[PDB]
């Protein structure tokens, strides 16, 4: 059964709630982004209206085969009426096509649902500037002060400089990048751009990328592995055994692998600056774990909430334990006492 923090009061609406069968009283299902924990349940057999971004609707039609007649894409930054209720979709700074949803309830209450997001000061100048928000349904993934990580720009600077140095030292090195979902495409696109290569990948991953409206994509990706020196593999294969096996397949073109695992936060973030990051190495294989996050750090989250000044916060992540819930509630009260709302 659908949990309460996926229901929008005063409406017929749910958010990210496709795994519960037919939800009682739901007239429109919203989908914030195409990540499996959120889309779980959708298929060619779904026959209710789904509301989402254009990019999410391209993925629903081509990857999950949802029929066209039930996909309702909305433009961003544009007031739209859905089943008698005004809504707006805003960029969530998460993966491609990911949105936050503003709902203007018939009684005057305004609700913001962040979906999954990486808070940024740019959001302070969106359509959020113009009005009060009563209720915030918040992505609390990293809601504790131990969760620190660098900017995405610093992480990409490290990746590009690391890959360009290695391949200039050894023109017979191959670069490999791990993936298991959409998001984090800048990692492998930026490395291929500095090296003058396309990114090589499976037909299934190429198909997925072609749904994303990324400009000049035909220029940056390929299914011809032999033409590429930056290869994408499943995240599960980014280990010494899986990389050894891959290097065999390349027919003696290469004699070294430099591999990247974009993770979120890891405990090594408590101690190590991005500059000082080192790989794990076995023979001619090196693996770098790089802290490329598509979720808010603690400080980014706190800044956003202290700017928005919501009357009530509903967490949507870390809700299953009492200890997590009590910790989050304590930080929400701190933020409110410090800022004065
Ligand atoms: Ni996500």
Q: Report the C-alpha radius of gyration, rounded.
A: 22 Å
Q: Outline the biggest β-sheet.
A: 7 strands, mixed
Look at the helices and sheets and give the structural class: alpha/beta
> Number of helical runs?
8
Shape: globular
Topology, number of strands: 18
CATH architecture of the largest domain: 4-Layer Sandwich
Query: Gap between N and C termini, in Å?
Result: 35 Å
What is the ordering of alpha helices and beta strands? EEEHEHEEEEEEHEHEHEEHEEEHEH
What molecules are bound to this protein? nickel (II) ion
Look up the CATH topology of the largest domain: Metallo-beta-lactamase, Chain A
Task: Describe the strand arrangement of the main beta sheet, using strand numbers.
Answer: 13-12-14-11-15-17-16
Fraction of residues in helix? 25-40%
At the fourth CATH level, what is the homologous superfamily of the largest domain? Ribonuclease Z/Hydroxyacylglutathione hydrolase-like
Approximately what portion of the residues adopt beta-strand conformation?
Answer: 15-25%
Q: Structurally, how many domains make up the residues?
A: 2
The CATH class of the largest domain, by name, is Alpha Beta
């Amino acid at each position: 059964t659908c949990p309460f923090y996926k229901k929008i009061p005063g409406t017929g609406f749910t958010v990210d709630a496709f795994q519960y069968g037919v939800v009682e009283g739901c007239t429109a299902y919203f989908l914030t982004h195409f990540h499996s924990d959120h889309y779980a349940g959708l298929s060619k057999h779904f026959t209710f209206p789904v509301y989402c971004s254009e990019i999410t609707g391209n993925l629903l039609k081509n990857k999950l085969h949802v029929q066209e007649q039930y996909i309702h894409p909305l433009p961003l930054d544009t007031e739209c009426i859905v089943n008698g209720v005004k809504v707006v979709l805003l960029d969530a700074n998460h993966c491609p096509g990911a949105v936050m949803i503003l709902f203007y309830l018939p009684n005057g209450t305004v609700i913001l649902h962040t979906g999954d997001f990486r808070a940024d000061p740019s959001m302070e100048r969106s359509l959020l500037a113009d009005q009060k928000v009563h209720m915030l349904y918040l992505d609390t993934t990293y809601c504790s002060p131990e969760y620190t990580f660098p900017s995405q720009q610093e992480v990409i600077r490290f990746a590009i400089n690391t890959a360009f140095e290695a391949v200039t030292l050894n023109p017979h090195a191959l670069v490999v990048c791990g993936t298991y979902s959409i998001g984090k495409e800048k990692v492998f696109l930026a490395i291929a751009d500095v090296l003058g290569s396309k990114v090589g990948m499976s037909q299934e991953k190429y198909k997925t990328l072609q749904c994303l409206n990324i400009p000049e994509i035909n220029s940056l990706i390929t299914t011809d592995m032999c033409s590429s020196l930056v290869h994408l593999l499943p995240m599960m294969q980014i280990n010494f055994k899986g990389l050894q096996s891959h290097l065999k397949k390349c027919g003696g073109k290469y004699n070294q692998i430099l591999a990247f695992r974009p993770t979120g936060w890891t405990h090594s973030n408590k101690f190590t600056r991005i500059a000082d990051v080192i790989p794990q190495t076995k023979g001619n294989i090196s693996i770098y774990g790089i802290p490329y996050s598509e979720h808010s750090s603690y400080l980014e989250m706190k800044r956003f909430v202290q700017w928005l000044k919501p009357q009530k916060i509903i967490p949507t992540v870390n809700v299953g334990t009492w200890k997590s819930r009590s910790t989050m509630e304590k930080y929400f009260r701190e933020w409110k006492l410090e800022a004065g709302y």
